[PDB]
Every structure is written in structure tokens, then in C-alpha cells.
Amino acid sequence: GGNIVVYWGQGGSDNSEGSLKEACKSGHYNMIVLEELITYDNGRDPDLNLGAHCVNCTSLQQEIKYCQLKLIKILLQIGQVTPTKEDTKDTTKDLSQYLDSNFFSGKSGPLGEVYLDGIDIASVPEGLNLKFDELVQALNDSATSRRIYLSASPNCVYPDYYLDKAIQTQKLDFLFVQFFYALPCIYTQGLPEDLFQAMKTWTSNVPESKIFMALPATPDLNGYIPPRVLNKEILPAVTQASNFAGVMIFDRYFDRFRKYSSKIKR
Amino acid sequence: GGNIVVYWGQGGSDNSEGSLKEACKSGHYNMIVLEELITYDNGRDPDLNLGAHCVNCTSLQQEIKYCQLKLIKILLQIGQVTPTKEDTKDTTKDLSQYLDSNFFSGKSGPLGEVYLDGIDIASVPEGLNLKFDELVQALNDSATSRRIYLSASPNCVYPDYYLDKAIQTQKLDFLFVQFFYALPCIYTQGLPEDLFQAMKTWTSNVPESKIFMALPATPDLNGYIPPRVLNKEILPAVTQASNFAGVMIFDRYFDRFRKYSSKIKR
Numbered sequence: 437g438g439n440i441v442v443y444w445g446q447g448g449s450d451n452s453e454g455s456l457k458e459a460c461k462s463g464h465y466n467m468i469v470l471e472e473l474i475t476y477d478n479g480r481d482p483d484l485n486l487g488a489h490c491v492n493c494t495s496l497q498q499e500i501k502y503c504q505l506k507l508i509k510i511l512l513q514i515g516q517v518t519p520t521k522e523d524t525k526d527t528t529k530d531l532s533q534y535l536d537s538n539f540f541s542g543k544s545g546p547l548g549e550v551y552l553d554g555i556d557i558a559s560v561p562e563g564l565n566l567k568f569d570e571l572v573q574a575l576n577d578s579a580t581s582r583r584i585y586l587s588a589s590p591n592c593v594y595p596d597y598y599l600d601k602a603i604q605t606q607k608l609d610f611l612f613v614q615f616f617y618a619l620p621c622i623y624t625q626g627l628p629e630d631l632f633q634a635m636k637t638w639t640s641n642v643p644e645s646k647i648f649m650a651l652p653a654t655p656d657l658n659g660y661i662p663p664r665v666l667n668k669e670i671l672p673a674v675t676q677a678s679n680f681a682g683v684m685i686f687d688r689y690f691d692r693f694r695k696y697s698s699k700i701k702r
Numbered sequence: 703g704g705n706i707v708v709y710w711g712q713g714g715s716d717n718s719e720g721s722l723k724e725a726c727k728s729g730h731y732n733m734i735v736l737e738e739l740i741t742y743d744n745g746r747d748p749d750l751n752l753g754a755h756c757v758n759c760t761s762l763q764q765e766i767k768y769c770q771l772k773l774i775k776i777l778l779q780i781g782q783v784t785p786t787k788e789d790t791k792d793t794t795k796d797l798s799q800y801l802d803s804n805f806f807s808g809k810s811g812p813l814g815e816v817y818l819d820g821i822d823i824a825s826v827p828e829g830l831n832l833k834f835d836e837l838v839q840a841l842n843d844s845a846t847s848r849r850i851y852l853s854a855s856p857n858c859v860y861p862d863y864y865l866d867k868a869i870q871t872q873k874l875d876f877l878f879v880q881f882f883y884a885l886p887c888i889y890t891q892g893l894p895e896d897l898f899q900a901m902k903t904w905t906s907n908v909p910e911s912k913i914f915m916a917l918p919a920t921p922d923l924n925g926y927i928p929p930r931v932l933n934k935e936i937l938p939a940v941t942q943a944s945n946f947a948g949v950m951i952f953d954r955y956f957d958r959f960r961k962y963s964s965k966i967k968r
């Protein structure tokens with residue numbers, strides 16, 4: 437089956453996109469990125485935002501552990517940095533410490549008593565105080581024997597305006613490169629040329645990281661690649677890169693109904 | 703000040719984007735579109751999704767009423783239709799009835815004991831059973847003496863693939879035409895030509911509806927129009943349309959920090 441990851445958490449409620457446990461139980465995925473943690477440039481404690489799944493999300497603990505028991509990695513995405521004009525000391529250091537204590541120590545944090553597998557950073561602006569590359573360095577230099585995977589979700593345009601500094605730390609394990617919405621590098625009908633060139637650029641310029649092609653599971657999003665095109669046309673070309681890792685599915689909501697991941701080649 | 707509306711509800715928590723009451727109290731807006739209600743193609747009761755603002759959102763009642771007391775209209779956006787392959791009878795009729803009872807009757811629904819001012823529909827796919835134009839007709843033919851405003855948020859491409867049928871009912875009071883993200887009709891630096899042509903097309907083809915130009919409040923989104931450009935370059939041209947209504951701000955989160963609406967001409 438190879439490596440197929442998925443985003444979950446912003447697809448509505450358990451009714452609309454399924455529980456986290458349902459996603460894991462499906463067997464389609466070996467990694468899930470939870471969307472998303474809101475962080476504060478002024479150092480206020482982060483706010484978890486799993487939409488209509490939960491407000492008290494501590495009961496997700498058992499679902500996270502169920503997933504991990506099935507060898508599925510669970511990463512939390514930082515999706516929003518609320519900016520401040522105030523100059524505040526130690527914001528990045530303090531966020532790293534907050535994350536370590538609340539998600540990477542088995543202690544009672546917003547997702548219950550878990551050890552998550554890592555942190556993803558969305559392609560969004562950093563703060564005047566909170567800096568992504570500094571955060572990546574801090575997390576990797578965490579006082580723990582646990583492995584904290586670090587990743588980012590840049591758009592397919594290289595360099596990514598928001599994430600390039602974090603990428604150039606050389607400390608990201610995975611990149612989920614987004615080939616959806618309107619960008620010059622997405623697949624369009626009968627035209628993978630720009631996608632191929634972008635994949636060449638990402639794989640060659642970030643040889644230290646595993647590169648995922650993040651694709652939409654619905655034809656109602658720009659960048660959609662029909663499964664036969666993906667299997668016969670795209671994967672044969674992009675898999676020539678030694679650091680091509682697999683496909684990241686945007687997102688669990690669309691995949692739950694479309695069963696796109698089910699149609700990807702073995 | 704004219705007509706300035708804003709989207710609120712998907713900007714995170716009260717910490718990140720402010721409470722609904724804060725938005726109303728700011729005095730920047732005369733209409734707020736709440737994002738967003740999830741509806742079900744199989745007829746399951748809708749799920750409210752105000753992200754990390756609340757799970758039990760009934761206490762928003764007092765904030766909605768405070769807003770309405772300041773002559774601010776509050777509309778709820780349908781942002782997601784969860785599809786089914788099942789053929790289910792009366793889905794659209796039953797949704798209209800659910801909305802009437804739960805948001806337009808002063809009874810105890812998901813937002814407490816309110817009479818909302820209307821319903822907006824996002825540019826998203828309808829269902830195999832739930833149909834937007836039929837929903838608009840049903841809501842307008844509601845057994846009530848209350849005014850239910852109906853609107854949609856099409857992208858700037860005309861016709862809008864998802865919403866054109868609803869628009870052609872001629873029963874939409876407002877259109878919030880979205881000139882952001884990557885589309886051929888957005889403003890780009892020194893180039894309003896495509897935006898002007900799109901505004902001409904929308905205003906001339908939908909003369910029965912009030913047309914809002916929905917714009918991003920942050921330079922970090924495609925389509926951003928610097929305030930001086932908006933005031934001196936865009937508004938003088940587009941305001942020549944008799945049905946040009948004003949500016950819709952995407953969104954309260956960005957506006958709270960950028961104060962974009964504050965910089966729009968009187």
C-alpha cells in the first residue's frame with residue numbers, strides 16, 4: 437500500500453467526517469495530521485481547534501492511542517499564528533516548552549494523556565515573536581528520548597514564502613507539498629508538466645526530507661488527479677525521486693465519501 | 703460609512719477572532735455572516751460549526767440580540783452539504799422546516815432563542831437530495847411574517863458552478879461575490895481589469911440582487927486590494943452600478959488585527 441497520509445479535524449463533526457478512530461480503523465492511512473492548533477504571538481496558551489468534533493477534546497486520547505497501536509503516526513498541525521505588535525520575550529522557547537509538556541510527555545493536555553508523534557506547520561504567516569524555524573530547532577532539541585517528527589505543509593510553489601526558513605533548518609522529517617487550490621504548479625487536465633517540475637524542485641532542493649505529494653480527494657477542488665492518471669501517469673514519474681514518500685490526502689472528509697485513497701495503486 | 707459586512711465564526715476561538723459581540727460592538731459592520739452550518743443530504747439534523755468558539759453555542763443568543771438591537775443583521779451560512787448516494791424523500795422541504803423552527807421562530811435552537819435575519823449559501827456542492835434553488839424557494843415561502851433575507855457567496859467567476867441555480871431564482875437579496883484566492887477575476891497589483899469586468903457581469907446579470915464585493919482584509923491572501931486602491935481606484939468605478947451594495951470583509955479574524963474596514967472611505 438505504501439505511504440498514504442491524511443488531514444483530519446477540519447471536516448466538521450464526527451457525523452460529517454467521522455471520528456479520528458474511524459479514520460484509523462479504515463486502514464487507508466499510516467499517518468494522520470490533526471488540524472489544527474491555534475498559537476499566540478503574545479505567548480497566550482494555544483487553543484485547540486478541531487471544529488465541531490469537540491470543545492473538550494481530552495477524550496480523543498483513547499482514539500489517538502488506538503491509532504498508534506495500529507502503527508499510525510499522529511501529528512498535530514499548527515494552523516494559525518495570532519499576531520501581536522507587542523515585543524514579547526521567549527515566545528518561541530515557551531511554545532516549544534508548552535508543546536513538549538502538553539502533547540509529548542504523556543501528561544494531561546488538550547488531547548488527554550498522550551505522546552503525539554509530531555508537529556506539522558501549515559503555510560501561514562509566523563509572528564513578530566513566534567518564529568517557525570526557531571520552533572523547529574527548539575522542538576528537535578527537546579529534553580526527551582521520544583522521537584518528535586517535524587513536518588510542514590508548504591504549497592507547491594518553491595520556495596514557500598512562509599515555510600522556507602523552517603525547511604532550510606534541514607530538520608523536517610516530512611514535507612506535505614500541497615498541489616491543490618489555484619497555483620501554477622497544480623495538475624490540470626492532460627497537463628502534469630508544472631506538477632512534475634515542482635516535484636523535481638522540491639525533491640532536489642530538500643533531499644534531507646521525505647516529500648509527500650498532497651492531493652485533493654475530490655474533483656470539486658482544483659488540482660484533482662483522477663486515480664487512473666495518478667496511478668499510470670503521475671506516480672511512475674515522481675517515484676523516481678529517492679525521497680518521494682507517498683501521497684497526502686486532502687482530506688478525511690472528502691476521502692470518507694469519495695474513497696480516493698482506496699483507488700491508489702499498491 | 704455605507705454597507706460593510708463581515709464573515710465571523712471560522713477564525714478560531716473568542717481569543718483569536720473575538721466574540722460575535724465584540725465584532726458588533728466594534729461598529730465597523732452592519733451585517734455579519736456566521737460561518738457555518740453543516741447540513742446533511744440524507745436528512746440528518748444539521749450540525750453548527752463555529753470552530754473553537756463554542757460547542758454548546760446557545761449562549762450566543764444574547765450576543766445575536768445585542769447585535770440586532772444595534773441594527774446589525776445576522777445571517778447563518780450553510781457551508782457544507784454532506785452527500786449521500788441514498789435517494790431520500792423531502793430532504794430540501796425538511797431542511798427548510800428545520801431552519802424555520804430552529805433559527806427563525808424565536809425558539810430554543812442551536813443559537814438559543816433567536817430570530818436570525820437570514821441564510822447565506824457558500825459556493826459548495828449541493829446534494830443528490832438537498833437542492834439550493836429549491837431551498838431558497840422554500841425559505842422564501844416560509845409560514846412566517848418575519849423577513850428572512852437570503853444570500854449566496856459565489857466566487858467571482860460568472861456563472862458560479864454551485865450557486866447559479868439559486869441565483870437564477872431571482873430570490874436572493876444579497877450576493878457576496880468573492881474576489882479572493884486564485885481566480886481569473888481577482889484584483890492583482892496594478893490590474894483591476896478582470897475585477898471590473900466581473901463586477902460588470904454580476905451587476906448586469908443579477909439586477910434583482912444587491913451585489914457586495916467580498917474582499918480579503920489581509921495582504922497574505924490573493925486578491926488583496928490596498929485601502930487607497932480600493933478607495934480611489936475600485937470603488938469609484940464599481941459604485942456606478944445601481945445594485946452595488948458595498949464591501950464584504952473576509953473575515954473578522956483578519957479585520958480584527960488589520961483594521962482594513964476602518965480604512966475604507968465614508
Ligand SMILES: *[C@@H]1O[C@H](CO)[C@@H](O[C@@H]2O[C@H](CO)[C@@H](O)[C@H](O)[C@H]2NC(C)=O)[C@H](O)[C@H]1NC(C)=O
Nearest residue numbers: 575576577578579580581582583584585586607
Ligand atoms: C532531532 O533530530 C535527530 C536527527 O533526526 C533525531 O536523532 C535521531 O534519534 C533517533 C531516536 O532517538 C535515533 O535512532 C537516531 O540515530 C538519531 N539520528 C541522528 C542523526 O542523531 C532526534 O531524535 C530528534 N529529536 C527529537 C526530539 O525527535
Ligand SMILES: *[C@@H]1O[C@H](CO)[C@@H](O[C@@H]2O[C@H](CO)[C@@H](O)[C@H](O)[C@H]2NC(C)=O)[C@H](O)[C@H]1NC(C)=O
Nearest residue numbers: 841842843844845846847848849850851852873
Ligand atoms: C420573500 O420575498 C418577498 C419579496 O422580496 C418578500 O416580500 C416582501 O416582504 C416585506 C415584509 O414582509 C414587504 O414589506 C414587501 O412589500 C414584500 N415585497 C414583495 C415584493 O412582496 C417576503 O417577505 C419574502 N419571504 C420571507 C420569509 O422573507
Ligand code: NA
Nearest residue numbers: 654655656827
Ligand atoms: Na466535493
Ligand code: NA
Nearest residue numbers: 561920921922
Ligand atoms: Na494574514
